[PDB]
Amino acid sequence: HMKPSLAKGTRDFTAQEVSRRKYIINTLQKNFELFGFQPLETPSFENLSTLTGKYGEEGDRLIFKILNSGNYTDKVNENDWQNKDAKKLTSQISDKALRYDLTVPFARFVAMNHGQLTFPFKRYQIQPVWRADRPQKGRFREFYQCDADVVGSESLWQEVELVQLYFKAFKELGVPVAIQMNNRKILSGLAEYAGITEQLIDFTVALDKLDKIGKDGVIKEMQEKGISNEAIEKLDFLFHQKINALENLQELKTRFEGVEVGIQGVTELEFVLSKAMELGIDNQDLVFNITLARGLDYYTGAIFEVKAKGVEMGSIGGGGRYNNLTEVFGVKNIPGIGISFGLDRTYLVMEELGLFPETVKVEYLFANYGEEEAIEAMKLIAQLREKGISAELYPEAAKLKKQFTYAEKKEIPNLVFLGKDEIENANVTIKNLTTGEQETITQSEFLK
Amino acid sequence: HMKPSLAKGTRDFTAQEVSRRKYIINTLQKNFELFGFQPLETPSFENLSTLTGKYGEEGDRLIFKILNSGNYTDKVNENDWQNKDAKKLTSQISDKALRYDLTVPFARFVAMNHGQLTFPFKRYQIQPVWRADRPQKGRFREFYQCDADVVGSESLWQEVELVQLYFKAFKELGVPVAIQMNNRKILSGLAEYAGITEQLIDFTVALDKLDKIGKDGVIKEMQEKGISNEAIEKLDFLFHQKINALENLQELKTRFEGVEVGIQGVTELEFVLSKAMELGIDNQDLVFNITLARGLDYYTGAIFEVKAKGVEMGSIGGGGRYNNLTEVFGVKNIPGIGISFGLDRTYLVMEELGLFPETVKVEYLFANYGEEEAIEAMKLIAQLREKGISAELYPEAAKLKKQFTYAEKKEIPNLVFLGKDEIENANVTIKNLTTGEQETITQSEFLK
Numbered sequence: 100h101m102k103p104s105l106a107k108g109t110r111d112f113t114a115q116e117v118s119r120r121k122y123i124i125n126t127l128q129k130n131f132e133l134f135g136f137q138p139l140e141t142p143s144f145e146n147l148s149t150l151t152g153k154y155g156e157e158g159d160r161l162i163f164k165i166l167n168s169g170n171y172t173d174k175v176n177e178n179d180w181q182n183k184d185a186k187k188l189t190s191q192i193s194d195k196a197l198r199y200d201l202t203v204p205f206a207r208f209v210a211m212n213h214g215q216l217t218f219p220f221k222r223y224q225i226q227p228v229w230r231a232d233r234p235q236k237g238r239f240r241e242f243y244q245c246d247a248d249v250v251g252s253e254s255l256w257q258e259v260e261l262v263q264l265y266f267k268a269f270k271e272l273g274v275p276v277a278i279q280m281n282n283r284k285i286l287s288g289l290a291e292y293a294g295i296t297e298q299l300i301d302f303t304v305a306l307d308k309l310d311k312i313g314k315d316g317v318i319k320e321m322q323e324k325g326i327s328n329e330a331i332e333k334l335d336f337l338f339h340q341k342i343n344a345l346e347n348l349q350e351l352k353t354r355f356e357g358v359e360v361g362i363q364g365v366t367e368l369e370f371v372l373s374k375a376m377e378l379g380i381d382n383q384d385l386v387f388n389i390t391l392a393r394g395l396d397y398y399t400g401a402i403f404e405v406k407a408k409g410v411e412m413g414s415i416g417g418g419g420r421y422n423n424l425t426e427v428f429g430v431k432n433i434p435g436i437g438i439s440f441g442l443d444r445t446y447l448v449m450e451e452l453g454l455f456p457e458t459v460k461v462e463y464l465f466a467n468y469g470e471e472e473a474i475e476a477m478k479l480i481a482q483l484r485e486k487g488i489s490a491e492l493y494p495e496a497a498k499l500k501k502q503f504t505y506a507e508k509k510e511i512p513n514l515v516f517l518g519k520d521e522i523e524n525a526n527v528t529i530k531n532l533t534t535g536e537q538e539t540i541t542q543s544e545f546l547k
Numbered sequence: 548h549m550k551p552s553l554a555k556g557t558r559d560f561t562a563q564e565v566s567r568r569k570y571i572i573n574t575l576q577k578n579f580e581l582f583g584f585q586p587l588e589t590p591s592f593e594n595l596s597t598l599t600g601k602y603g604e605e606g607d608r609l610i611f612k613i614l615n616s617g618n619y620t621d622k623v624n625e626n627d628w629q630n631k632d633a634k635k636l637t638s639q640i641s642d643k644a645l646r647y648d649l650t651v652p653f654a655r656f657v658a659m660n661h662g663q664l665t666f667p668f669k670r671y672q673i674q675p676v677w678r679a680d681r682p683q684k685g686r687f688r689e690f691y692q693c694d695a696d697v698v699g700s701e702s703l704w705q706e707v708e709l710v711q712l713y714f715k716a717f718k719e720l721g722v723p724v725a726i727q728m729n730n731r732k733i734l735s736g737l738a739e740y741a742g743i744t745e746q747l748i749d750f751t752v753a754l755d756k757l758d759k760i761g762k763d764g765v766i767k768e769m770q771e772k773g774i775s776n777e778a779i780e781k782l783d784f785l786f787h788q789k790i791n792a793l794e795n796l797q798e799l800k801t802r803f804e805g806v807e808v809g810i811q812g813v814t815e816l817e818f819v820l821s822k823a824m825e826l827g828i829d830n831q832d833l834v835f836n837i838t839l840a841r842g843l844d845y846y847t848g849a850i851f852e853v854k855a856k857g858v859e860m861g862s863i864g865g866g867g868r869y870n871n872l873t874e875v876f877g878v879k880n881i882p883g884i885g886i887s888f889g890l891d892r893t894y895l896v897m898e899e900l901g902l903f904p905e906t907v908k909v910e911y912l913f914a915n916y917g918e919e920e921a922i923e924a925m926k927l928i929a930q931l932r933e934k935g936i937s938a939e940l941y942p943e944a945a946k947l948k949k950q951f952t953y954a955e956k957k958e959i960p961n962l963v964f965l966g967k968d969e970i971e972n973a974n975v976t977i978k979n980l981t982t983g984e985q986e987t988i989t990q991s992e993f994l995k
Contacts, residue, residue: 101596109592111590113587117588135908139560148551165645166611166637183628207551219942241591428550459585474826481826
C-alpha cells in the first residue's frame with residue numbers, strides 16, 4: 100500500500116544511540132543507588148483529573164489526552180456537542196492522559212501510599228514523558244526525564260548531599276560541570292529591601308548580563324524594564340561583588356538587616372556552601388549566583404542549575420526545595436527537595452566532548468561453507484557464547500565476497516574459516532579484519 | 548482537594564519490583580547481544596494509519612488513540628458529527644496512536660530504512676505496549692513486550708540459532724523450559740491429506756487432550772466438533788506416536804506422499820530438530836508437537852512455544868517464521884523469523900520458583916548527633932561512596948530511637964556511630980543490625 104512515516108515529533112533509535120542512552124541512564128542509576136535513592140515507576144497513563152490543573156493556568160493544552168474506548172460520544176453533554184466546545188468535551192470523551200512530568204505522579208504515589216512509606220523517602224525516577232508543546236527547535240514530543248527527590252524533611256544536609264550527587268554523577272559521565280545555587284528567600288529579601296517585588300525576573304535577567312555588556316549596559320536595561328533608580332542604587336553593591344562567595348553572602352545579610360526572609364535565605368545558603376567547602380568542593384564549581392531564578396512560584400529554598408563547563412549549551416539539570424509535595428492532593432506536611440538531569444542535553448554535551456565509550460556486533464563471524472561444515476561452526480559458536488564471546492554463523496552458503504561484505508558493513512572484527520581441513524585437523528582459521536592478518540591455530544588455543 | 552487514584556488497568560512499581568523487572572530485561576539484553584542481535588527502539592506514538600488495519604478485522608478497537616491537540620473538532624465531517632458516528636470520527640479527531648505491538652513498528656522501520664540496512668538484519672526490541680483489550684484476569688493495559696527478529700533470509704540455521712537463544716536466555720534466568728515446535732506446512736499437509744481444511748484448530752485442540760482424557764475421549768470431541776471419522780481414521784497413527792520425534796516425522800512424511808506441502812514441512816522441521824540434537828540439545832526439552840498451532844494465518848514455517856517445566860503457567864514465549872515483514876507497507880521480499888519472551892509470565896514463574904536474586908538500601912546509615920559531628924560523617928560517607936559502598940547520613944539530629952527505627956524499616960544492615968570520641972580518636976563505631984554485634988575500629992581499618 101502507501102509508504103509509512105513517523106508521527107510528527109518522534110524518531111527511531113538505532114543500536115548506537117540506544118547504547119549511548121542506556122550508558123547515561125545506567126551511570127545515573129548506579130550513582131542514585133550509592134546515594135540511597137530507590138527507583139519508582141508510575142504508569143504511562145494517569146487519570147485526566149490527576150494531571151489537569153497541575154501545569155499552570157494554560158498548561159492543560161500541553162497534555163496528550165487518550166480518547167475513550169468504544170463509543171466515546173455515548174454520553175456527551177448535548178449543548179456542548181452541538182456547540183462543538185472541544186475544550187468542555189475533552190473530559191467527556193477522554194478520561195486518561197499521558198505522563199507529562201515525573202513530579203505529579205510521584206506526588207500521587209505519595210498521596211496514595213504515604214501511610215505505608217518510611218520517611219525520609221528517597222526516590223529516583225527515569226521514564227519517558229510526553230508533551231504537546233509548540234514546535235521548539237531541539238526538543239521532541241517524547242523524551243526521558245530523570246528526577247531524584249527526597250521528602251519528609253527540611254534538613255539542609257539534604258541539599259549538601261544532592262550537590263555531591265550532581266558532582267559525582269557528572270564526574271562518572273566525564274562531564275565537568277559548574278553548579279549555580281541561589282535561594283528563593285534571598286530573592287524575596289531583594290524584593291522587600293529594594294522594592295522590586297514582581298520585578299525579580301527582569302532584574303536578574305539584566306544583572307546576569309554584567310560580564311558581557313558591562314554595568315552601564317545592565318543599568319540601562321533595568322531602567323528600560325521599569326526598575327527604579329532607587330532600587331538600582333540600593334543594590335549598587337551587587338555590581339561590585341568580591342571573589343569570596345561567602346563574603347558576598349555576608350554583605351547581603353548585613354543589608355537585609357530588618358528583612359528577616361532575606362536573612363533566612365542567606366543563612367540557609369551559607370550552610371550549604373560552607374559545608375560543601377569543608378567536604379572538598381571547589382568554590383569555582385559550586386557558585387552562589389543571585390541571578391539564578393528558576394521556579395519562582397515553586398521553590399521555597401535552595402535552587403540549583405547545572406551547566407557543563409566550556410560548552411555552549413543550555414542547563415543540563417536543575418532543581419530545588421519546595422514546600423509540600425502532596426499539596427495538590429490534600430495531604431499536608433510532606434516537604435521535599437528534588438533535582439533533575441537533562442538527558443538529551445547531557446547526551447549532546449557528551450557527544451561534543453567525545454565522552455561516549457567505544458558497539459554491538461559479534462566478535463567472530465563464521466563463514467558458511469555449506470550444510471555439512473556449518474554444524475561444526477555452530478558447535479564452536481556455542482562454546483564461544485558460553486565463555487561470554489559473541490559470535491554467529493553467516494546463515495547461507497553464499498559466495499565468500501557476500502559474507503565478507505556483510506562482516507565489513509557490520510564492522511565485525513574477525514572472520515572465521517572452519518572448512519573441511521580445519522575440521523578434520525581440529526583447527527580454526529581466523530582472519531583479523533582490523534590488521535588484515537590471518538592465522539590457523541588449534542581449536543584448543545582458540546578457546547583458551 | 549480530592550484524593551487521587553490510578554487509571555484503570557495500571558499500577559505503580561516500587562523498588563523491589565523494578566529491580567526484578569530490570570534483572571530479567573538485562574539478562575535477556577545481554578543474551579541477545581551474544582547472539583548478534585542489536586537493540587531497536589521505536590516511538591510510543593505511531594501515526595493512526597500505521598497501526599489501523601494491522602491487527603485483524605476487529606482489532607482497531609483495541610488500539611489507544613491520542614486526541615488531536617487544539618480544536619480537534621475544527622475539521623469534522625458535518626454529517627458524521629451530527630450522526631455522532633464515533634468510529635468514522637476517530638480518524639477525524641485523532642491522527643496518533645500508542646504502540647500496540649513491536650512487529651508493526653519494526654516493519655515500518657524496515658520499510659522506511661531498508662535501503663540503508665545490512666541484511667540479514669538482527670534486532671531485539673524491549674519496550675512497553677498499550678492495549679485497550681477487554682478486562683482479562685492477570686493482564687494489564689500497559690506491559691512490556693520483548694521481541695527478537697532476523698529478516699532477509701529463509702535459512703533454517705536461523706531457526707536453530709533462535710532455539711539456542713531461548714535455551715540460553717532461560718538458563719541464565721534459571722528457568723527450566725521445554726520448547727514445543729511445529730511447522731505450518733505440516734498442518735497444511737494434514738489439512739490436505741485428511742481433508743480437515745478449516746478444522747485445524749478444533750482438531751489440534753482435541754488431539755492435545757490425548758494424555759489427559761484418552762483416545763476415546765479425544766475422538767468423541769473431534770466428532771462433536773465435526774471432524775469426520777474418515778479423517779479421524781486416516782490420522783489414527785497420530786494416536787500411537789513413538790518415542791523418537793524423528794520417527795514420528797518420518798511416519799508423517801511417508802503418509803504425505805503426494806502432499807508436497809506436508810513433505811516440505813516435515814523436511815524443514817527435521818532439519819531444525821536434527822541439527823539441534825547434534826548441538827547437544829535434549830529431545831525432551833525440544834519437542835515436535837503437531838498440535839501446536841499458534842498464528843495459523845501468520846506463520847508460514849516453524850512455530851515455537853515455550854513453557855516452564857513443572858509450573859502451572861501459560862506459555863512464556865513463542866514465535867516463528869513469516870513470509871514478508873514489510874508486506875503491509877508495500878515492500879516485498881523481506882522474509883523473517885521472530886521469537887518473543889513473555890515477561891510478566893516469566894516474572895510470575897521466577898517468583899514461584901524463588902529465582903529472583905537477593906535490594907536497594909544503603910549498607911551504612913550514619914547516626915546524626917548534631918551539626919558539628921555530622922560533617923565528619925559526611926566526610927566518611929563520601930569516602931565509602933568513592934569505593935563503591937552505599938551510605939547516607941540520617942538528615943536530622945533526631946532521637947536515636949527514631950534513627951534506629953528508620954534503619955529498621957529500610958532494612959539497612961549497619962548503623963554507624965561517629966561521635967565526638969570516635970572523631971577525636973579517628974575511630975568509627977559500627978553497629979551490625981544483622982548480628983546485633985557492635986565494635987569500634989579505626990577509620991583506617993573501616994576504609995581498608
